[PDB]
Design a protein around this ligand. Structure first.
Ligand code: CA
Ligand code: CA
Ligand code: CA
Length: 614
């Protein structure tokens, strides 16, 4: 297969294979592909029916099971293959090989475990200890169906069973009653046979995995069950849970879909109606019965193919695929941070903001790959949907570790950061919300959006380059650097914190105060004819700090020859409208016959390359 997909060309990816699965276009998967993001090097876990050995998974599927496929029998032993797992796995990670359809994360690998009939190898603790980054759970418990006085199923005019509605207060009460036992269960390794589903998924979430669940197919008046309300008991894992509703098209829930309801603050919507994916079918070779007697006499074949299916079970793996693609885009992010990107970049549907039908809205890879749109705290969640104890962290802690460095050390998802996004990344999306940002790691993060997040910005390590704007106060600590040609609210550079305006020679704009503490660094680039770095601030407090002068993009302070070639040049390196208070400690470099000199003109600070009082 010669793939016509090309970097920079989203329409090049819209091939016949691509177009056979309408959900891909609906989540804008082609925009991720065009930027090189396919889920390559990412492992997805599936808990469902045993996935069929299918061409679409050849070389990329590991099963951890008791070595049999899942089969359902009726009263007369008519045998059928459970092709649910195969269908789910295909939506997330079928090969892009020019045949049939392909997954959202078409370069991702798959580890599959059996939901049911697992014997004494359920593979759960193995899955938890694997490098599987995200686990798809396209399963759950059905509520009662409403029955007539005879005991027959009452059907709604829409063709669906009249399911009884779960009640918010009752599902949350059931979860709260399970809390102490589920907490205990989650701390031990998962037994290989009988086991607690709730303890298993809590343990996986606490081992750094993203847990993705189908909302259920129990009608729009319905809400998710107690299992899917586990974050109410364990709000520490809310950011590692995503509940997924079923969209019949880009804007509308399937008539069968369960609503987000009480899970709305950790819920998104994805395509789930008439999804074309991988299946298997148990078939008679002799045009005879498909039953156990025939299976045993070798009369049957289990054949791979494709088929349509509908349900939140088909929506969930779109989000699992989206998560794997984003873990290649943002290899330094933890699962809770990948979750934040998926939630805050979803296209808002229905009632404005987070709502009981669509939650955060339709997952959108085109927006997701440009970074998060919100640093979420409790104050960003409508009270109706707020899970008590959730979103209590003020800071989004972004670790850009630098190429060759380990992230999530001591966890099953521990990995080396080996892509270019690990030394330099940029987020172009506008970031709002009440949270703040903490930049750590030796690498560089550039922010290009018009950011309104209310929290403080802490640069603890490496470079934060502001090219758009932040309304936030910035604190630059030891080994950190504030850079860029954009705007910040205010900054305070501490001992061994640096400010380096521009991308090379440029101006950093500060809406309020620029503060330099003792031992802070101001790295000024200069060129010919009074062109230099500058801070344009409302007001400045210089409690000390060193001004360090170099030529543009030079790794060293001015040499003696460079300084002498600039002798007599004057520069403006700091302007205020309301005044400069105090002075820098010193200005480097300084030589016997040429030095950098600082000139304090009341509202501005000048810099000269001057003689040494001679
Ligand atoms: Ca394919
Ligand atoms: Ca909405
Ligand atoms: Ca500069």
């Amino acid at each position: 297969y010669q793939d016509p997909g090309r970097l920079g060309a989203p329409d090049s990816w819209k091939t016949a294979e691509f177009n056979r699965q309408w959900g891909l276009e609906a989540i804008s998967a082609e925009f991720a592909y065009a930027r090189g993001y396919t889920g390559k090097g990412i492992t997805i876990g599936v808990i469902d029916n045993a996935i069929l050995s299918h061409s679409e998974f050849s070389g990329k599927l590991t099963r951890l099971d008791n070595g049999s496929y899942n089969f359902s029998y009726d009263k007369q032993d008519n045998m059928s293959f459970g092709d649910h797992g195969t269908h789910v796995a295909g939506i997330a990670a079928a090969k892009r090989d020019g045949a049939g359809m392909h997954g959202v994360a078409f370069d991702a690998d798959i580890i599959g475990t059996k939901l049911n009939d697992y014997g004494n190898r359920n593979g759960r603790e193995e899955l938890i200890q694997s490098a599987a980054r995200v686990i798809n759970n396209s399963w759950g418990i059905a509520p009662d169906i409403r029955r007539d006085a005879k005991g027959d199923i009452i059907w709604l005019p829409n063709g669906r069973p009249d399911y009884v509605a779960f009640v918010k207060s009752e599902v949350i009460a059931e979860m709260m009653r399970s809390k102490s036992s589920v907490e205990w269960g989650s701390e031990q390794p998962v037994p290989t046979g009988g086991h607690s589903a709730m303890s298993t998924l809590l343990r996986a979430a606490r081992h750094g995995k993203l847990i993705v669940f189908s909302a259920g197919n129990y009608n729009n008046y319905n809400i998710p069950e107690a299992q899917k309300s586990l974050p109410y008991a364990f709000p520490d894992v809310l950011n590692n849970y995503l509940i997924v509703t079923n969209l019949s098209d880009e804007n509308q829930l399937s008539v069968s879909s369960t609503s987000c309801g009480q899970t709305a603050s950790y819920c998104v919507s994805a395509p789930g109606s008439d999804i074309y994916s991988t299946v298997g079918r148990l078939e008679s070779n002799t045009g005879g019965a498909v039953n156990r007697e025939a299976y045993n006499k070798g009369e049957l074949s289990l054949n791979p193919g494709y088929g349509n299916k509908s349900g939140t079970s088909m929506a969930a793996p779109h989000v699992t695929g989206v998560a794997a693609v984003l873990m290649q885009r943002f290899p330094y992010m933890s699962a809770d941070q990948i979750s934040a990107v998926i939630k805050t970049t979803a296209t808002d549907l229905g009632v404005a903001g987070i709502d009981n039908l669509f939650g955060w809205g339709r997952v959108n890879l085109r927006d997701a790959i440009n970074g998060p749109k919100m640093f979420i705290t409790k104050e960003d969640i409508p009270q109706e949907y707020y899970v008590p104890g959730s979103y209590s962290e003020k800071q989004f802690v972004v670790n850009i570790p630098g190429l060759g460095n380990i992230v999530e050390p001591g966890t099953p998802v521990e990995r080396r950061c080996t892509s270019s996004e690990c030394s330099f990344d940029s987020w172009s999306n506008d970031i709002s919300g009440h949270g703040g940002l903490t930049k750590t790691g030796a690498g560089t993060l550039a922010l290009l959006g018009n950011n309104t997040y209310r929290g403080d910005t802490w640069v603890k390590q490496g470079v934060l380059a502001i090219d758009g704007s932040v309304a936030s106060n910035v604190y630059i600590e030891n080994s950190g650097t504030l850079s860029g040609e954009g705007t910040v609210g205010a900054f305070r550079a501490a001992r061994s914190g640096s400010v380096a305006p521009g991308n090379g020679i440029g101006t950093l704009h500060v809406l309020h105060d620029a503060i330099f503490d003792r031992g802070s660094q101001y790295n000024v680039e200069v060129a010919d004819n009074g062109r230099s770095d500058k801070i344009a601030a409302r007001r400045a407090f210089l409690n000390g700090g060193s001004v360090n002068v170099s030529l543009e993009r030079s790794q060293n302070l001015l040499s003696q020859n460079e300084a002498q070639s600039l002798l007599g040049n004057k520069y403006t390196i700091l302007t205020t409208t309301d005044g400069v208070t105090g002075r820098f400690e010193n200005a480097n470099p300084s030589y016997p016959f040429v030095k950098v000199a600082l000139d304090y003109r009341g509202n501005d600070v000048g810099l000269g390359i001057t003689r040494t009082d001679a």
